[PDB]
Design a protein around this ligand. Structure first.
Ligand SMILES: *c1nnnn1-c1cccc(C(C)=O)c1
Length: 258
């Protein structure tokens, strides 16, 4: 069972950072129209089309629409990632150039599972079991056939189930909790602040605790101080595990709550 419908594509890397993506493309010798597909870490169920042209990198976010299709911003809709990559191979339709050489995964390397795989394989699975009591091949398919709005809802409160989320911690209590454990770089927790609906990332770097404000837009996207936007806190954390993006350091291991 592969929860991501792009899992069968040889050029799909799963949940990787932009740096690793660009690394794979360089070792593919660069060249115009060299491309790969990866999971989007900001938009739930989405992808990023990583392309190179004029020996410089391009990254096109692909958003999953409500009706289950996929589209680059202002672009046409496609029923799936596979369909999407095939179309753009035969017609740039806004891209700097058409997809040519697929930067396939090197032998041994599988797609990295991320939030989306976990959302479906664990959380939607349990949601489906609780509501319909399905078991075998009926539980699967049902897992990949839920509406994007249901997946979004589960994902939105998923952080409440994560060990790094501390539902009631002051700034001072967070520091004390972090200093009183292993003071390793990237040790972290997330905590709600007074103002609805703001949160704080508390992390250790150089044996010093740092606090970062997280606020959500009027669009409901969760924003780090650098301004990068995420559908969920869960995605925000998983993203910062792979890229600092205005943090003094990446998130590594959770400071456990209970
Ligand atoms: C995702 N992929 N494997 N396991 N998970 C996961 C992590 C934390 C919580 C949950 C729940 C409660 O479903 C699943």
């Amino acid at each position: 069972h592969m929860p991501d419908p792009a899992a069968h594509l040889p050029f799909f890397y799963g949940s990787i950072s932009r740096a690793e993506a660009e690394e794979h493309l360089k070792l593919a010798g660069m060249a115009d129209g060299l491309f790969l597909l990866r999971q989007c870490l900001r938009s739930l169920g989405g992808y990023v089309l990583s392309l190179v042209h004029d020996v410089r990198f391009h990254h096109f976010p692909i958003e999953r629409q409500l009706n289950g299709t996929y589209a680059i911003a202002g672009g046409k809709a496609h029923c799936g990632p596979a369909e999407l990559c095939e179309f753009y191979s035969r017609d740039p339709d806004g891209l700097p150039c058409n997809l040519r050489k697929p930067c396939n995964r090197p032998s041994g390397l599988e797609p990295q599972p991320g939030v989306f795989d976990c959302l479906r394989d664990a959380m939607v699975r349990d949601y489906v079991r609780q509501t319909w009591k399905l078991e075998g091949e009926a539980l699967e398919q049902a897992i990949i056939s839920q509406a994007p709005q249901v997946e979004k809802l589960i994902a939105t409160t998923a952080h409440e189930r994560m060990p790094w989320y501390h539902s009631s911690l002051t700034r001072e209590e967070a520091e004390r909790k972090l200093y009183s454990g292993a003071q390793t770089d990237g040790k972290f927790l997330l905590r709600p602040r007074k103002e609805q609906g703001t949160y704080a990332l508390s992390l250790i770097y150089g044996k010093t605790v740092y606090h970062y404000l997280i606020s959500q837009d009027k669009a409901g996207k969760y924003c780090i101080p650098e301004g990068t936007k995420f559908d969920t806190l869960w995605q925000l954390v998983e993203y910062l595990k792979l890229k600092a993006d205005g943090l003094i350091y990446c998130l590594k291991e959770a400071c456990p709550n209970s």
